[PDB]
Amino acid sequence: SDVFHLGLTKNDLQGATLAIVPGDPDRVEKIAALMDKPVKLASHREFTTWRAELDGKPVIVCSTGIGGPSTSIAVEELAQLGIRTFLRIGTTGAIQPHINVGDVLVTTASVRLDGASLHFAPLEFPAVADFECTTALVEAAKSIGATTHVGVTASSDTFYPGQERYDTYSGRVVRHFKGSMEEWQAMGVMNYEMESATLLTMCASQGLRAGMVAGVIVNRTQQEIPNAETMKQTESHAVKIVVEAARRLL
Amino acid sequence: KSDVFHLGLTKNDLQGATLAIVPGDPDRVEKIAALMDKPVKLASHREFTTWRAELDGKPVIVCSTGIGGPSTSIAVEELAQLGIRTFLRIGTTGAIQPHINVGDVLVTTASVRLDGASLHFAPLEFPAVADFECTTALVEAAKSIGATTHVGVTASSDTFYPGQERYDTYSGRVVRHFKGSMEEWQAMGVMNYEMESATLLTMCASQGLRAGMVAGVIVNRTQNAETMKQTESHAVKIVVEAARRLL
Amino acid sequence: SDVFHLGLTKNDLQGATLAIVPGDPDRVEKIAALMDKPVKLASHREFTTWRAELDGKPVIVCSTGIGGPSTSIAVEELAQLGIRTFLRIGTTGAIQPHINVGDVLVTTASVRLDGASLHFAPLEFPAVADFECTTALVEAAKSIGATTHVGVTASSDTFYPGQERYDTYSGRVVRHFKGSMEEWQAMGVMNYEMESATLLTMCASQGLRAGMVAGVIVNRTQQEIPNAETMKQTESHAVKIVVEAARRLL
Amino acid sequence: SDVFHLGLTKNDLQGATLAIVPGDPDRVEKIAALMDKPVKLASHREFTTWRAELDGKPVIVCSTGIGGPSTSIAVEELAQLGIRTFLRIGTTGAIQPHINVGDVLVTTASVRLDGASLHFAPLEFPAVADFECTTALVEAAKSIGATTHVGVTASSDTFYPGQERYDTYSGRVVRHFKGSMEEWQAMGVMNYEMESATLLTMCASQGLRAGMVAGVIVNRTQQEIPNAETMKQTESHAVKIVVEAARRLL
Amino acid sequence: SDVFHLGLTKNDLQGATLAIVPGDPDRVEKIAALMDKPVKLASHREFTTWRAELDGKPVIVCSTGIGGPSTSIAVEELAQLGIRTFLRIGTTGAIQPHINVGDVLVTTASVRLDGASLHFAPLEFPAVADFECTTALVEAAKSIGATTHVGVTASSDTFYPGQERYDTYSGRVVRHFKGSMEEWQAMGVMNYEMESATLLTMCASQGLRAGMVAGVIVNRTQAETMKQTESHAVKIVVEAARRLL
Amino acid sequence: KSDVFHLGLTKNDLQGATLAIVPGDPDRVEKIAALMDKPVKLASHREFTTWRAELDGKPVIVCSTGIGGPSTSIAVEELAQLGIRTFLRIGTTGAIQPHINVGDVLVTTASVRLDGASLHFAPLEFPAVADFECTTALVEAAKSIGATTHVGVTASSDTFYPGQERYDTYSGRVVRHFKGSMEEWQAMGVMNYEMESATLLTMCASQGLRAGMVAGVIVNRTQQEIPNAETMKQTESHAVKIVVEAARRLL
Numbered sequence A, C, D: 001s002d003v004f005h006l007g008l009t010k011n012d013l014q015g016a017t018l019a020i021v022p023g024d025p026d027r028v029e030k031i032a033a034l035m036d037k038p039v040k041l042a043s044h045r046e047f048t049t050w051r052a053e054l055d056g057k058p059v060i061v062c063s064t065g066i067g068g069p070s071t072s073i074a075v076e077e078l079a080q081l082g083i084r085t086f087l088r089i090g091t092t093g094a095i096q097p098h099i100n101v102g103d104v105l106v107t108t109a110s111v112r113l114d115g116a117s118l119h120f121a122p123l124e125f126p127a128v129a130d131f132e133c134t135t136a137l138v139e140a141a142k143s144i145g146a147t148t149h150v151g152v153t154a155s156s157d158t159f160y161p162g163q164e165r166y167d168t169y170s171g172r173v174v175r176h177f178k179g180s181m182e183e184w185q186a187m188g189v190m191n192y193e194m195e196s197a198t199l200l201t202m203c204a205s206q207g208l209r210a211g212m213v214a215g216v217i218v219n220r221t222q223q224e225i226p227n228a229e230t231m232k233q234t235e236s237h238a239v240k241i242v243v244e245a246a247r248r249l250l
Numbered sequence B: 001k002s003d004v005f006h007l008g009l010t011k012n013d014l015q016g017a018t019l020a021i022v023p024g025d026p027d028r029v030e031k032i033a034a035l036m037d038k039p040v041k042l043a044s045h046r047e048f049t050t051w052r053a054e055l056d057g058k059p060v061i062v063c064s065t066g067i068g069g070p071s072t073s074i075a076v077e078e079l080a081q082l083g084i085r086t087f088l089r090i091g092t093t094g095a096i097q098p099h100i101n102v103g104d105v106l107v108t109t110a111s112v113r114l115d116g117a118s119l120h121f122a123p124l125e126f127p128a129v130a131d132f133e134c135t136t137a138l139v140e141a142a143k144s145i146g147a148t149t150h151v152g153v154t155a156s157s158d159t160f161y162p163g164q165e166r167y168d169t170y171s172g173r174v175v176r177h178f179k180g181s182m183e184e185w186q187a188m189g190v191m192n193y194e195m196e197s198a199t200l201l202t203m204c205a206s207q208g209l210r211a212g213m214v215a216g217v218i219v220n221r222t223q224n225a226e227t228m229k230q231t232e233s234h235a236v237k238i239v240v241e242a243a244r245r246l247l
Numbered sequence E: 001s002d003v004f005h006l007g008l009t010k011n012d013l014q015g016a017t018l019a020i021v022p023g024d025p026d027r028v029e030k031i032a033a034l035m036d037k038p039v040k041l042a043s044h045r046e047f048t049t050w051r052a053e054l055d056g057k058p059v060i061v062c063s064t065g066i067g068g069p070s071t072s073i074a075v076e077e078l079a080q081l082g083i084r085t086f087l088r089i090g091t092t093g094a095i096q097p098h099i100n101v102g103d104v105l106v107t108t109a110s111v112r113l114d115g116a117s118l119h120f121a122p123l124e125f126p127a128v129a130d131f132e133c134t135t136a137l138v139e140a141a142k143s144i145g146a147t148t149h150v151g152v153t154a155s156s157d158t159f160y161p162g163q164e165r166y167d168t169y170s171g172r173v174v175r176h177f178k179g180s181m182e183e184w185q186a187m188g189v190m191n192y193e194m195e196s197a198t199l200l201t202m203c204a205s206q207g208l209r210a211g212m213v214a215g216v217i218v219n220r221t222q223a224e225t226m227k228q229t230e231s232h233a234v235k236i237v238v239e240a241a242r243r244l245l
Numbered sequence F: 001k002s003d004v005f006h007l008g009l010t011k012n013d014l015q016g017a018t019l020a021i022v023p024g025d026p027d028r029v030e031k032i033a034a035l036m037d038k039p040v041k042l043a044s045h046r047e048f049t050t051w052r053a054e055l056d057g058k059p060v061i062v063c064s065t066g067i068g069g070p071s072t073s074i075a076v077e078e079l080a081q082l083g084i085r086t087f088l089r090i091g092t093t094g095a096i097q098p099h100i101n102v103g104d105v106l107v108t109t110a111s112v113r114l115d116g117a118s119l120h121f122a123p124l125e126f127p128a129v130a131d132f133e134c135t136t137a138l139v140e141a142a143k144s145i146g147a148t149t150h151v152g153v154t155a156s157s158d159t160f161y162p163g164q165e166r167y168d169t170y171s172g173r174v175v176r177h178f179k180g181s182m183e184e185w186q187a188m189g190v191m192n193y194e195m196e197s198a199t200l201l202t203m204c205a206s207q208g209l210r211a212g213m214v215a216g217v218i219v220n221r222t223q224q225e226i227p228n229a230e231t232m233k234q235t236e237s238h239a240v241k242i243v244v245e246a247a248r249r250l251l
């Protein structure tokens, strides 16, 4: 292995410069199966890597795990191995009333409610997505025909207090995050997730291209629990979009 | 006499216009408006000069903001009250990357917030990001007229001198916070310096308004009078062509 | 010209070391007319410059515009040309019930609700006026006989949200500035304006003398819309004080 | 399941109130095997859970993954299920010249170079370990006879820039973290890891008991590559200490 | 004198490496009297210094005054003279309902509501007590038989607004501290005092050992017992010093 | 016996006094009070010593604050509760400008806030500014007795050592934040270092109380590190005469 965590060599990639980066290790195979000649490379901790082919060109699929810290490890080590373009796909909870479950969201930039992004750039630096990657995702969503929303995402280091959840062990939220959801809502923020602030900041400040797409599985203004059947269809919809976007970026 | 506090305009003056081009210089307002059909002056107060014109049978507004976030925030807020929903900024800039030449055109995706006024609308963690439709329109308009274009991040400062790390000043010193800042921005891939985009993009993105940013390079910090005039005409043609696609 | 923005040479000043700095470019001609031998020097962007004579000594009047950014340009370039003393004249809105419309205010120091001051000194540094300039303004106010208050001013980078105005397009104020006016009121702050924080900080941290005087045109506890008759008389009253103060500082 | 991520019910725990929380899902079986009646419960994403018995009392072992974010999900959902005491075991890189590879470190408190801790308490709040937990670990290390150091730990949201590593894709470190290692060294900080700031802050501010122990696999002042032989013995040493400390806290 | 403020030479210490550091200059004699052969060395400003014998070993008692600033002067100058272990004793106001007047509190670490700690380490650094010192204080509390609580302390640069007191001249508390007591209460913070954050931070970041113990004289949620509580706590800090010689 | 928590004073003890001179050293209180008519000792508790005197037929208070903002904030609050409305501080200082000499007098217009206590009264953006009437009286009194006076900005630190960039210490190190800080304040025109002005001026200006600050230079940091004990004695007596004369103008 040429790297500390992923368990991969330069030869394993076979000249790949683009990677799709989901959060769940168990979802890596499903994405790679949509492309040609899928093969397993490695699995260590939360990092599972598969290789595939797209229009005769090698492509990587690699899981990051939950959160900025493990995402920062995966992105750095993939960059060392030659990756220059990163496309993230994940699940999300919407905070706007007009956004429904099953909708697809493309992130232009993120609210930095994380710690890892500060290790690459000061807070004043924008957590902005690459223009070519964002274009490819919006065009891919229109190609397959989905309800799409484009805008700002709130990216939090926690699932609970940072997203103003009160049904917890303590039942309390620290002063800084008290009434924060209502503030983001008024500012036009679409949704909550946990990795995009880190990914977009670290790529934009290091000459790497990054894009972000997500499927809505819950709306915070309507309900609190997701549905099992609709989630699988929504995940399938978002996967098709990210693969189609990767096609345009090769 | 007036519906607003500073601009001196009524809703009737706009004639249903929802788009506005916002330069910094009051003197350059006439020049932009003359490129479009039926140009007419409306008001001239302080640093704010407003002109109305017609683009493809649709009314468009041109209004100067002056230098800096404070007066930009006054102009944008008062124009939004009058019915404007789309704002397109055009200005001059100094490039900090060696590959970007004088005469090049730059489109801003988002800005580094080295200003104060942006914080009056959203906390620092909120991204000073441009609208996707506006950015697309500006990029496609630049390709239409044929120009050397660079797309990326811009540093937006509340000063011209210390915040942009200039040492040829009265004091000859730069405060600790900004010492070595230019080298840091350069390493992070930041294209250029200007003085208004962070305020404009933050206030628009956090209030449901569409904003875009385009600039012409007149100097490179790592390295002519007539070349500055040609660069302005090149950039002005792009912002008008982009406005056509957004109507 | 020897400067980037103002369009002036060192010769145009003719040995001048003091400058009166208003905000409105249209007000420059009125202030210069009060002094002997007025002449137009330059007009570029928001910067209009006039040269006059006071007691046989050359004096400059130069507009800064609204806000710290353009003010920082004007002051720096004037300092390069030889100016060592700066006196600001402007309008203001009072936040104290005991201060009435028509009163004159002299600022000792300012609350830094701006960005430009930070480009010259860290936040812990006081935005304080020069003692000789402040004494000259107070004694000039007593010379003409006007109701004067001396104290602290809040200096904001915006006209609307930073001064807690809710009659706007969005009708919202960001968390940081919510309830800020009530806090400044309890702390004894007299008024709101938009330039003093930048001017006083940049001068005090660079060895330049600076003073600040203002006329109250509106009271926030009483009304919102100003007048026409009383505004003109207050602006004529305050201008007299700033010229009289310049006589003492020459 | 009673929770969102772990895939566990309250009855699965069988009355357990203590959990050992490693980072690596693969290390869970190895810790559980030291105790009586070890059995698998669930495996979802980076969260693997096993149940065992210690002196006739049920105990839980659950993986957190790398980083504060996934750690915060695991700790919260375990607290919902009845866990009140948390003991972390991990690997670390030492930054003091007097600490040898193979040594064991017990953390009294942590430097907060993370984001997640801020979602529970403001920066001024100490990321401090529980006194009873710290005592148990120190006495357990004395029991088996290991070389032990007790003190402060630096806890970072990144593996690379936040720990001032320069052998990377960019080869640069952001201004904030430039020269930071030398600063921590002078302040007597022992080591770098990635989860203790989150764990200790979130427990101390919510009435939960937490302790932290680690085995040194590399010294940053000596070499940059860990020895893949003594590492197995070091991790075996640290596991024995955490299990013996758990015995004392039942 | 070998120092700027304290008025002491290295010879005055007679080889002492441990110091008990109260806030009150008038309480220095009272603490020393519990040990053998106490003698006054110096009295300058708010710094009163006595030396005594404990189990045949010399021990220093030196007042710091109220607040981080004067504390930082005393600790630094004592370190120059050879002191390596510092044990603080004081009074406190509890903010938890379960802690009674007369109880004894041992601080593991402190909430940094002070300015002086920042002059030694950035805010992210923990104001944590030394493990050996904390252990000795807990064991000494059991030795005399007190009702003891161990945990986190809020350390403030003011007595009034920083501790959310509204019975003042202004009757107001700045926004930053409005509702702060309730927040600390929910986070399990035991009490308020004015020096621990400075002491613990400056010692932990400079290789010096420090411990903190206090007697509860008032409960914020709720003369006679005030003197008894102080006598109880002083006995503990001297007994703790015995185990650290 | 006492109307306050710390000072050990009743409102009746003040006899109608509204002005207080506030030094740092408890042992310097008697020296200032001896300059005025009918001096009497009221109380001595902790670092707080209080004397009462008469000035031009009007009662005046002298009360020590101790070193640092924390104890200063206690003294000021409890004196205000007893009716004091005007505060004048006197102390010793170390100059950081080459042109300021030992024996000079400094009057502070406003202070750089390198303290913690000031934040408990107003956010950092609020200026630590002195009262205009108090400042005017201090400058005029200095010219009255004839002294070399400088008016400007003071750096007010929560420590004596690292916050004032002293390296001759036990550790020999200064935290990143304050490394190179003295050179920065020097370039910005800051006159000197002391330890209480930021707290005093902020808390008074934000609560409707009048405050003034004056100090005597006993050391210059660019010239030396250890003050001459003979010159300190003379400078102290010089500064005390000014603060009493300034108090006369404000009654």
Ligand SMILES: O=c1[nH]c(=O)n(COCCO)c(O)c1Cc1cccc(OCc2ccccc2)c1
Residues within 6 Å of the ligand: A066, A091, A092, A093, A159, A163, A192, A193, A194, A217, A218, A224, A225, A226, A231, D003, D004, D005
């Ligand atoms: O609100 C959310 N915030 C987020 O940050 N994310 C993104 O994934 C983070 C790790 O789960 C996310 O996705 C959601 C949506 C959501 C709501 C409730 C419970 C969720 O979790 C797992 C689960 C439990 C039961 C059935 C299906 C899924 C997810």
Ligand SMILES: O=c1[nH]c(=O)n(COCCO)c(O)c1Cc1cccc(OCc2ccccc2)c1
Residues within 6 Å of the ligand: B067, B091, B092, B093, B094, B160, B164, B193, B194, B195, B218, B219, C004, C005
């Ligand atoms: O470096 C820059 N930073 C900027 O923020 N801007 C943007 O305009 C801000 C107000 O001028 C900007 O454009 C430049 C480029 C530049 C370099 C040197 C001098 C400049 O000033 C005005 C000028 C001087 C002489 C002839 C024409 C214009 C502008």
Ligand SMILES: O=c1[nH]c(=O)n(COCCO)c(O)c1Cc1cccc(OCc2ccccc2)c1
Residues within 6 Å of the ligand: B004, B005, B006, C066, C091, C092, C093, C159, C163, C192, C193, C194, C217, C218, C224, C225, C226, C227
């Ligand atoms: O509340 C104020 N805050 C301020 O910061 N300033 C200072 O001028 C900033 C530039 O406008 C200021 O002056 C005022 C008073 C005021 C209130 C309402 C409208 C104002 O604007 C211009 C106007 C409109 C209608 C009639 C006369 C003047 C000014």
Ligand SMILES: O=c1[nH]c(=O)n(COCCO)c(O)c1Cc1cccc(OCc2ccccc2)c1
Residues within 6 Å of the ligand: A004, A005, D066, D091, D092, D093, D159, D163, D192, D193, D194, D217, D218, D224, D225, D226, D228
């Ligand atoms: O310096 C460190 N910082 C840390 O934060 N951690 C803690 O684990 C975090 C996830 O690896 C940790 O442990 C170390 C020690 C270290 C140094 C170099 C490479 C390392 O990585 C994995 C590995 C690769 C090859 C052989 C053994 C271990 C670990």
Ligand SMILES: O=c1[nH]c(=O)n(COCCO)c(O)c1Cc1cccc(OCc2ccccc2)c1
Residues within 6 Å of the ligand: E066, E090, E091, E092, E093, E159, E163, E192, E193, E194, E217, E218, E226, F004, F005, F006
């Ligand atoms: O609430 C407190 N906060 C604290 O920071 N401290 C610590 O001592 C700091 C200086 O008193 C502390 O101890 C207390 C307890 C307390 C409450 C009310 C009055 C107090 O003051 C002195 C006094 C007044 C009247 C009778 C006896 C003692 C002390």
Ligand SMILES: O=c1[nH]c(=O)n(COCCO)c(O)c1Cc1cccc(OCc2ccccc2)c1
Residues within 6 Å of the ligand: E004, E005, F067, F092, F093, F094, F160, F164, F193, F194, F195, F218, F219, F225, F226, F227, F228, F229, F232
């Ligand atoms: O540099 C200084 N910074 C200050 O903050 N102060 C103000 O007094 C604070 C408590 O000493 C202050 O005064 C000085 C001048 C100074 C320098 C070295 C030693 C000093 O202390 C007492 C002393 C010791 C030996 C001979 C004479 C005086 C005072």
Ligand SMILES: [K+]
Residues within 6 Å of the ligand: A046, A064, A065, A066, A067, A070, D046, D064, D065, D066, D067, D070
């Ligand atoms: K993870």
Ligand SMILES: [K+]
Residues within 6 Å of the ligand: B047, B065, B066, B067, B068, B071, C046, C064, C065, C066, C067, C070
């Ligand atoms: K302007």
Ligand SMILES: [K+]
Residues within 6 Å of the ligand: E046, E064, E065, E066, E067, E070, F047, F065, F066, F067, F068, F071
């Ligand atoms: K003190």
